[PDB]
Amino acid sequence: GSSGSSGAKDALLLWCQMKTAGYPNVNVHNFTTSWRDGLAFNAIVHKHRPDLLDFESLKKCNAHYNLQNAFNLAEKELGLTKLLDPEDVNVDQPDEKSIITYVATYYHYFSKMKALAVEGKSGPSSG
């Protein structure tokens, strides 16, 4: 029982889906059993910076690591605040609300850069 396309966390869900699409293994269908493994996160970055990590080297078995690595790499390179952990998220049915918030940063952040925008931020600076 479902028609058309309804939902609030769609704009984002679609974003990750489009990017992740590049890879077959990587698939963003939901916001719970999609980031539990880790690849998902290791798929968004690699896309922007294939240097940071080597998806090819990564494996679709280990999560605890694939998670911490992604959270770290970004928490260091990009400079995002680790809101979640590679152990907290890794679960049968994690809190989609606790994840959507994190992944939301990847979109906003990257978006800030040279890209389409309307009535947004003037991107401040300091240094």
Q: Could you tell me the CATH number of the domain that includes residue 31? A: 1.10.418.10
**To which residue do tokens 């990009």 refer?**
78
For residue 84, give the DSSP letter: S
Residue 123 within a domain: no
Going by C-beta distance under 8 Å and a sequence separation of 6 or more, which residues neighbour residue 32?
93, 94, 95, 96, 99
Residue 93 within a domain: yes
Residue 104 within a domain: yes
Candidates 51, 23, 31; CA nearest to 104 is 31
Residue span of the structural domain in which 90 resides: 8-112
**Residues preceding gaps in the chain (C to N > 2.5 Å):** none
The total of other beta-carbon atoms located within 10 Å of residue 114's CB is 6
